Amino acid sequence: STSTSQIAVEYPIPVYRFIVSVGDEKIPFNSVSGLDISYDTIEYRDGVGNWFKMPGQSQSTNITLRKGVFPGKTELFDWINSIQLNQVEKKDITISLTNDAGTELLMTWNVSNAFPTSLTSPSFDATSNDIAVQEITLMADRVIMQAV
Amino acid sequence: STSTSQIAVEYPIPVYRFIVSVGDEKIPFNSVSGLDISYDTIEYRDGVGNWFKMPGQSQSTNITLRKGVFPGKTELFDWINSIQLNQVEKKDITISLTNDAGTELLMTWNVSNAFPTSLTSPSFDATSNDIAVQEITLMADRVIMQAV
Amino acid sequence: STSTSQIAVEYPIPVYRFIVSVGDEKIPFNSVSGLDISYDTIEYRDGVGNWFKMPGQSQSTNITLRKGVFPGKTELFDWINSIQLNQVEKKDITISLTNDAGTELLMTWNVSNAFPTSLTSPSFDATSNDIAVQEITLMADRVIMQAV
Amino acid sequence: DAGTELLMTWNVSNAFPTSLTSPSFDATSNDIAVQEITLMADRVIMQAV
Amino acid sequence: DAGTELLMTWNVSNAFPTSLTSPSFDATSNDIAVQEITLMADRVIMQAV
Amino acid sequence: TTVTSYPGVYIEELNSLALSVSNSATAVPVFAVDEQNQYISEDNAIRINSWMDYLNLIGNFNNEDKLDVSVRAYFANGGGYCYLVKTTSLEKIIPTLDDVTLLVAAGEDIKTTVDVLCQPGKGLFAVFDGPETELTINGAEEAKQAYTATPFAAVYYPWLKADWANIDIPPSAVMAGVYASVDLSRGVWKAPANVALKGGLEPKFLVTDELQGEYNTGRAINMIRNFSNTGTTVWGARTLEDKDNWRYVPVRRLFNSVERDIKRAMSFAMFEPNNQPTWERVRAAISNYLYSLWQQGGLAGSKEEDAYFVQIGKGITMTQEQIDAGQMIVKVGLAAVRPAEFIILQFTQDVE
Amino acid sequence: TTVTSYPGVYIEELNSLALSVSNSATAVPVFAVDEQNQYISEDNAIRINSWMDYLNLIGNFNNEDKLDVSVRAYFANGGGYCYLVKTTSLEKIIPTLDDVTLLVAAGEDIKTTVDVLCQPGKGLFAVFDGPETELTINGAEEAKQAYTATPFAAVYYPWLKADWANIDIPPSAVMAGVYASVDLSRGVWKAPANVALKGGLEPKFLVTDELQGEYNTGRAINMIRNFSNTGTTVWGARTLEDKDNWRYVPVRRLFNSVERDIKRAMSFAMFEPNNQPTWERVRAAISNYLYSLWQQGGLAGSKEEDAYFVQIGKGITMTQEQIDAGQMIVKVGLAAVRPAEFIILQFTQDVE
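Above: the input entities. Below: the structure tokens describing the complete assembly.
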């Protein structure tokens, strides 16, 4: 006999309900991938036997967002088309696990200074029953995870 | 109760209905692959701690078009056969997602200066129930995506 | 969330976009090398212990410009062919880092009185997939670096 | 990290520049324009903290 | 391992330092700051145990 | 000026001075202009992008004008674009202009307008002049009585003089350019003191160290004095507030700059639905900005959680009553760096 | 224009401006046109599908016309097809046209017609202009007295100006396009404020923040003012009603849009037998629509049963007497989202 407010505190969070917000816009995405912290390890070892292991230089964060093609809207493409030589508008991406008809966040990830590389066009295919989907890849720094 | 003009505005576009147009010709293709933007990333990192990430040098676009073998027609082969030393006729390829019996485009991709490398002959096979298909591979620049 | 005008002020400049201008002409080059200042050091040392280090005589500037072979044009060769005994036309070379489709310079180097030595012909090679390239070497004086 | 505290310190006296090296401009490279400056000096000393 | 017992021994006499080498500071490296010291000496002898 | 009929080239000979342009994101001054100035009109600000832009508005450079010699000293030190508002309509135009940060009196009485527009909410900092007369260590606490005790104001004493200027230059106009030159080279968090003046300036009155000790304490008057190795230089960073919170102009100008940048990030949250998915986007936008400012060294803290904190919430900051009214309350804290102002040397005769 | 005899191609050179077409389901404005307009006739609405459609009706674009510069600013911001009704026959044609939602005064006195056609039953919303004169914070409550206190109206103050337009543009004509651009990109429930104007617009009068505090309270005048990072932008969502029910234009325009869509679902129930199998089809048709609107985020409620309720019945809503008269009574309730209008930052000097 678990109460419905006990499940909100004790139970794990399902992945499939999430909100992605790219800058000031919020746009519906099919899937989000990557988005993990990582560290190189530095190892010193000298002759008397002691072995030092340290966290080292952080690694660059690479995120992949996947989204279907909608008939009026290309604002994933216009972001990657605006790249002149090294100047692009970087913007913050927030992923947020929500409840059904999300008025309440459960977890929140924050990405800083994300800019697009490698927008992937759909694979046109005459014998396929799929939607035209696009992956955009983002390079960024500082994934942080926020409670609620 | 979704109206049929609401589906034209809100719903995603299926991949299987598309028009490929190679230069002045338009020819029916079985599948189109590749056709994505990409960028190298330049990373500067100095001693005080700040880490600069930039979009860098663009990558070359490589497209793969697949097409069945028809009895009178070899004009994918005659394009790749006309390569003398570095001189080939480059032409623009446009992919375009359409409706049923296409009189109306929904999305449009444009490829500039595409020229053929690596025409692939069918694999003749006495125990196979397939059509003779051919892949042609194109190297090009500047994929752009146009709304409608 | 870096703005696109902040990147123009704070971020380092990528090397690959540059304009070379030889005299009144401007010609597209594949790579530019050398082009650095240098100084000999004079060291005095006497018996009481004090050691004087000084900047000394400047060194001659040697630049190497690399360029592919184009079918109608030999004006790197006609410059080095015009050397009669010690008389050659010296001209000023300016390198300039630019933006994409350069209407705006970011940095500028200036070379004075450059004249050609050692034009290098391409290495013809039946098993190579390369372009015919040529290096010209320039001896000059006074590299100066100008902001914007 | 975010340096408010030194761990080691080297000190160089009377350094003056020779041989500033300009970047190698290169149309097929994905690098930043970097410069090396070379300094001649005397008396490197190493200080704890 | 956890040395309470020597297996071989080398002995150097009258060693004095030349050429202490400072670490190469490098913003894109995952290494420890290391130093080499160089010693000039005489009479390396090798002792059993 | 010059009339061009044939293509050619033209080898006109004229003496006109040209100053290089600078772009400053953080310091946009507004020069108070006296009445009996025939060039600018009442009730509109004239944006002057460069010294050449100013030299098109007036025909000749005038040595006798207080406005002319103050604007040339401003652009020679490295100032960006500025506005020119007349002093009687000055209280109407500064609220219209959005990105104005500094308020500069170029030898003008703005003490009436500074009390009514410099508030804790608004981002205006107001540098103005010291008294033109050569003052004393003796009657020193009466000169500090003339100025208000607001934390948003700094007073720089000696009216500078130049060989090109006939009259003495007000020192606040050269300090609008020093503020822009400091923040571009080292940051807003760095104090504008011990910076040399790039123009041909030197103080009218040489100031003893014992006199500067009088004025630095209570309602502090920063002072520009000459050093033989540095030339002329600025030698103060203190505001007119003596309280330990807002004593220094790098701390007051950092908080003015941070809250203006947070203003722009809260601009996108305007007229969005007032629920939790907005508040976790408001907090994430501020937390990115204060982190990258801490990484530049702007905020003082060894640990990142010591430099700042942001708090939004329905239990924390805003009531259910206040949410229905339409309000959204955020709490931000910062930890600025203070400048080292005194250095005490102890010289011992025996080495041990 | 162009005469074509040979097949060929034609490389005519002419400067004509072309604007891209947009289809808007929710916002169909009606532009009030003054008399002494020789192009449209009395007592018929002229549907203008596009800017090219308008540019065929009139020969040249005229800078001096109030109607011309208002229609071009409407299509540049993203407006769909609109109607052109003359202002004296305006009260006869708007009841004829079914799908008209907005009523736009392009610099016209429609205060007589808005009182007689904007009713709680009819779905008309009426955006019109502020006063053309530069107003004051001082005589501010007299300017709100000129406008009626109806909840269906919004007033946008500064008459915009453009480089192509010789005269100043009425601000209501650019807001019919901003209404269509907001509802297509984010929905009718989103307020039309902090949206930049796509045409080359900027306000005639820069508006201080203290002046906007006067006009926002009682009979609210929304204001279009310039921000240095955003450009020109809309900065208000309030109607002319001060009551807490219909304070904001996203809540009033949501209820106008919902009841128009429910109008279409009750169109099929017309002249059907008045018994229970009809009423459970009327309720099911509304319950599908409000659920899919709640799933889009249009109605505010965590639980689906909190956002809306529909009630039909013989015991509940209609009498046995009213059924024999032919009436059918349904009760619908909604819970709209309110926009966050004020954001209060508290900056603390100590981090803890």
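Note for the figure: The longest helix of chain G spans residues 276-295.
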